Design a protein around this nucleic acid. Structure first.
Ligand SMILES: [Zn+2]
Lengths: 286, 45, 37, 127, 135
RNA sequence: UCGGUUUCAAGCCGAUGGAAGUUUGAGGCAAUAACAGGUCUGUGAUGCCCUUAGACGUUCUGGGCCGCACGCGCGCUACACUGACGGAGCCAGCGAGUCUAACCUUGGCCGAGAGGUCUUGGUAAUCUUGUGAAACUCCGUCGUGCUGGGGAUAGAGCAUUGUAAUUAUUGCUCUUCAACGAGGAAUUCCUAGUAAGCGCAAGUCAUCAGCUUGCGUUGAUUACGUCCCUGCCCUUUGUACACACC
């Protein structure tokens, strides 16, 4: 797994060589020793072999000596620290360390920047490791995807975490002082919050999306003030999203709505008076 | 200004500017450790 | 501790034998415990 | 009052009668016995009480026995109980009877979790 | 058993000891509604007041309510021994009591303010608790 | 044994008979070539730092290991009416148990209970013990109402183990009755005396489980298929990219 600490053991040179193996494994399968010696743009065996010893000791690389075929294998940690080094260069992350959100294809940590403003890190682990090209590649494409979806969600006004950065399969996002529908006990204006959560699914099917899974743990609720009680309805849902043209968009949309109403019925004992928005009205709305 | 430092000048490669807002209130039991006093006037906002 | 190898750990304190599991597995055949099933 | 009796009557009552008026815990704690060391301590205590300037506070006595139940003989005493690191001067009141000394000497500082600022700078540095 | 039918008579919602009691539940679980009295205590009290509990709470006279309130304030004189009581062997007075519905909370505050005025671990942890959790 | 199948060759598969016929089903034993894997309190004028006011040694108190916005996980108890409560029926197996000590304990008295007290059998296929276990059976109360489901949290008392129970060991009595109306993405385990439900015993054990391993009690649904994914292989084949050209 992820041990961010170890990254502050590496120098300019160890990152240089690790980068060289990153350019050399995306060109050839198993990068041999001379490939790393010649591509790294280094001086001698001194710097490169010392660097590789560091990376191999700190589990960023694996030595594959296949019947005279000497080569190397970049582990997930290597990719992690290269994205993280790219972000250290792009002045986006400065410290890491507090795990809230252990997803299947996503790990969520708590990070910080130069200024001290708290943020969140969603790295993507497809298959967690028997590394081929597809695991790393599709994790990279996964976070690309989710960051682009996220950027289009922040751009169009939706209350969705502002995407700051997409370092490969890793994504830096805004920390949101919120609480999920489980941890929430009661609200001062439950009908307004329902109106909000329905108007949102309306505008989402107006954009062309149907976030198939709109449950209780999905919806975060950020509090801005304690005297006046200001709420904000954050929603984490992107790879489970289903476009408005798919054959099955109907019961997905109406499952979202039925879940909104069923939770608002149980936890806050507030049933909706206006009829729930069907798929058809939103099929014309887009 | 090295006088305006709570930690060693190394801010380029180190931790983050930790802020220690000190809310010191005085407990009036006669003779009492700093611990009990640390557990009598604790406020949260 | 295990009265064989200076070990606080592994102790089978049962029946007053007090051998850690590692040494007791070795001395098992000399004690009387044999492999049947 | 401790069992519905005047404070002076109880104060001037032996430990056996205080055992006669006590909950089960105290009666069993004392019927099983007590060590010889507090016999010195309980003298130290009274020594202070007997060298005290009138109408003020008597001399403080530092204690380590957090397991000693408060018995009427020690009421009005200023006692510096050991928490494990520091002493705490607590003056014995009529209300403290039956209780262990350690309850008046917390063993730890509270857990202040409501500080996200110092939590965003207690992170692992990535540099 | 016996299908016996009474035209009216029963009331829907009654009140005893300044507390609300609802009359169609059995008398045990109609008296359980209040604080200070549970299933087992209302059971024993309604075995002491010689009231038939198999007969519901809509079939009870005020003469039985006066006996019930009577046994509420004298549980040691109707032979309900001290094991059965909430607040037995009090330190303040040295007696045994069974506290009622509005008095249990006052006794609770008396207890926690006893531990706070003494300054025990329970008091400090309790107050710092409520304070910091609420804030 | 009979019949399919196979060069009608070693075998496979179905049926029948059989205590038992997937190899009736589980696991230990080698030689082999790979190990900087653990320590021996093994040894040799062997290379290191010093050499000793260092506490790596002792002790003595009292605090810790639980401290709580939360993340993660194994679980225990639950959302009831194939159910809870109250009455009666009453059926196991695997164990274990005391000496120069106090272990497993019948029975008689006291007690609401927890427990106490006076005795006793057994070093045990002989005594506890038929371990009169629970789920379960039957006769009643409740009636779908967070209810009499659930028993969190919290109050006061009473006892036990322990030198010592406060941050509450545990047990017992009364009271408080929180969340939880079959649970999202997802995921674990299982083919017959097996899953599941149910308790008991033994290890930790001075007090305890919700820990573990066995045991017996009650006892289903669904396959007896496939390579769909998961892997594990073993073939065939092209080839190091034999580091081909950009
Ligand atoms: Zn050993």
């Amino acid at each position: 797994k992820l041990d961010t600490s170890h990254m502050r053991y590496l120098t300019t040179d160890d990152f240089r060589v690790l980068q060289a193996v990153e350019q050399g494994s995306r060109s050839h399968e198993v990068v041999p020793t001379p490939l790393i010696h010649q591509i790294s743009g280094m001086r001698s065996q001194s710097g490169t072999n010392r660097a590789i010893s560091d990376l191999a000791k700190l589990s960023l690389i694996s030595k594959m000596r296949n019947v005279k075929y000497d080569g190397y294998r970049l582990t997930y940690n290597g990719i992690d620290y290269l994205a993280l080094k790219t972000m250290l260069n792009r002045d986006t992350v400065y410290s890491v360390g507090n795990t809230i959100g252990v997803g299947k294809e996503s790990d969520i940590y708590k990070v910080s920047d130069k200024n001290g403003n708290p943020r969140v890190m969603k790295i993507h682990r497809l298959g967690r490791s028997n590394q081929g090209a597809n695991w790393m590649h599709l994790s990279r494409l996964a976070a690309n995807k989710e960051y682009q979806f996220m950027s289009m969600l922040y751009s169009k006004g939706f209350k969705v975490p502002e995407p700051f950065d997409n370092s490969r399969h890793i994504v830096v996002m805004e920390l949101i002082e919120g609480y999920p529908m489980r941890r929430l006990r009661k609200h001062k204006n439950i009908p307004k919050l329902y109106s909000d959560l329905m108007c949102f699914i309306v505008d989402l099917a107006n954009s062309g999306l149907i976030h198939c899974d709109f449950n209780e743990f999905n919806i975060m609720i950020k509090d801005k003030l304690e005297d006046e009680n200001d709420c904000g309805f954050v929603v984490i849902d992107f790879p489970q999203c289903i476009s408005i043209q798919h054959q099955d968009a109907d019961y997905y949309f109406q499952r979202d709505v039925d879940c909104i109403r069923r939770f608002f019925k149980k936890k806050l004992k507030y049933e909706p008076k206006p009829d729930s928005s069907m798929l058809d009205t939103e099929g014309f709305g887009d | 200004e090295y006088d305006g430092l709570t930690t060693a000048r190394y801010d380029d490669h180190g931790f983050l500017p930790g802020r220690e807002q000190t809310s010191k209130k005085a407990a009036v039991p006669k003779g009492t450790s700093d611990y009990q006093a640390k557990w009598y006037l604790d406020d949260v906002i | 501790q295990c009265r064989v190898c200076s070990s606080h750990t592994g102790l089978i304190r049962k029946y007053g034998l007090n051998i850690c599991r590692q040494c007791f597995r070795e001395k098992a055949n000399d004690i009387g415990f044999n492999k049947f099933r | 009052s401790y069992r519905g009796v005047d404070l002076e009557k109880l104060l001037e009552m032996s430990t056996e009668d205080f055992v006669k008026l006590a909950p089960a815990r105290v009666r069993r704690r004392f019927a099983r016995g007590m060590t010889s060391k507090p016999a010195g301590f309980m003298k130290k205590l009274r020594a202070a009480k007997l060298a005290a300037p009138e109408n003020e506070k008597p001399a403080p006595v530092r204690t380590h026995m957090r397991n000693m139940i408060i018995v009427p003989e020690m009421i009005g005493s200023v006692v510096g109980i050991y928490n494990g690191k520091a002493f705490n001067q607590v003056e014995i009141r009529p209300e403290m009877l039956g209780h262990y000394l350690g309850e008046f000497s917390i063993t730890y500082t509270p857990v202040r979790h409501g500080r996200a600022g110092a939590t965003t700078s207690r992170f692992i540095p990535l540099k | 058993s016996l299908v016996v039918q009474e035209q009216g008579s029963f009331q829907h919602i009654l009140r005893l000891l300044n507390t609300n009691v609802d009359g169609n539940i059995k008398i045990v679980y109609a008296l359980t509604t209040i604080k200070g009295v549970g299933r087992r205590y209302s059971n024993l009290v309604c075995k002491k007041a010689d009231v038939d509990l198999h007969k519901r709470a809509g079939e009870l006279t005020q003469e039985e309510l006066e006996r019930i309130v009577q046994i509420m304030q004298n549980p040691t004189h109707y032979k309900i021994p001290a094991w059965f009581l909430n607040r037995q062997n009090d330190i303040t007075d040295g007696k045994d009591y069974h506290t009622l519905a509005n008095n249990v909370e006052s006794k609770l505050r008396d207890d926690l303010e006893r531990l706070k005025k003494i300054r025990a671990h329970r008091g400090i942890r309790h107050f710092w608790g409520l304070r910091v959790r609420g804030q």
